[PDB]
Structure formats: structure tokens, C-alpha cells
Amino acid sequence: SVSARKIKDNAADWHNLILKWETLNDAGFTTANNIANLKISLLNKSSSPASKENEEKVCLEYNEELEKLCEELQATLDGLTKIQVKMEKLSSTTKGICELENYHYGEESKRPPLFHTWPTTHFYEVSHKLLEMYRKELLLKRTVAKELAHTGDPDLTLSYLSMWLHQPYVESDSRLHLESMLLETGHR
């Protein structure tokens, strides 16, 4: 049916947006990891006069590079924000498909599944759960990015850096929810 093709395409769209998210998150981690390491080197600053002079000049250039890296990290957040808005579109699309099915074919309890077993509303419930997770993850990343650029403790930097990569909200069950949609719709 037409709705089946739309739902299968919607699941594929979720896969592609989640891939773009991971691509940007990995790139952001590289940037965030460069900020942390330069910060720790800058924070590590009765030695020889040559060493003092050298350390002084090197640390001035650390500050310049750190400012460029922080702007680079903000650009990644901008890319992730664009993805999160596209995800809200995808969740809204799933919702609209459910509304189209109800109007054209009546009560869902009396319609057959589009594929194997899922009622069409279950696609929306899963889609909305994914949106909710990435909403929370994006909010957390702005705090992480803010802390990285201002924190002065190496250990905190590592903890925040670990949060950026592990993604406590997305890592919980993003894969399982996505996989269940791809499995039901017959994707690879």
C-alpha cells in the first residue's frame, strides 16, 4: 500500500538522520578532544630562562587555537540542531500517516498491519521516543560544550568529553528502537 511505502521510507529516513548525527558527533568529539588536550597542556604551564620564554610564547598560541576550536565545536552543534529539527519532521510525518490511515480506513483495531504485526500507531510511538531522546541529548551537548571551553580541571574535562561520545540519552536504546522499525519494515 501507499502508507506501507511511506512508513518504510520514514524508517529509512530515521536511519539516515541517525547516521548523520553520529557522523557529526564523531567530528565534534575530535574537536572536543583537541580542546581538552590543549587545555591540559595550557593548564600544565624555576626552570631555565629558555624554557620560560618558550613556554610563554607557546601558551599564547594555545589560546588562539582554543578559540578557533570552540567556534568549530559550535558549528558542529549547529549541524546537530538542524538534524534534530529534521527528526521532529520525521516524527510529525509518522503521526500524519497514522491520521491518514484512520480517516481513510477507520479504526486501527480493525485494520491489518502494514507489514508483519505492528499497528501503524506503534511506528509513531517509537518515532516519538527517538525524537524525545535526541532532544535531551542535544540539550546535554550544549552544557558539555560550554563546560569544555571554560572548565579548568583535567579530570572534569575527561568526564565531559566522555559524555559527548557516550551520549547517555541516545546510547540507552536508540539502536534497539531504530532496529525494531527497520526489522518490521524489512530493511537491511
Residue numbers in the entry: 17 to 61, 68 to 210
Reproduce passages from the article.
We show that SPATA5 and SPATA5L1 associate in a DNA-binding heterohexameric complex together with heterodimeric alpha-helical proteins C1orf109 and CINP. This chromatin-associated complex, which we name 55LCC, uses ATPase activity to process replisome substrates in S-phase, facilitating their proteolytic turnover from chromatin to ensure DNA replication and mitotic fidelity. SPATA5 and SPATA5L1 belong to the CDC48 family of type II AAA+ ATPases, which contain two ATPase domains separated by an intervening sequence and an N-terminal region that typically is used to specify protein-protein interactions. We propose that 55LCC acts as an unfoldase, thereby remodeling protein complexes and facilitating their subsequent cleavage by cysteine proteases and removal from chromatin.
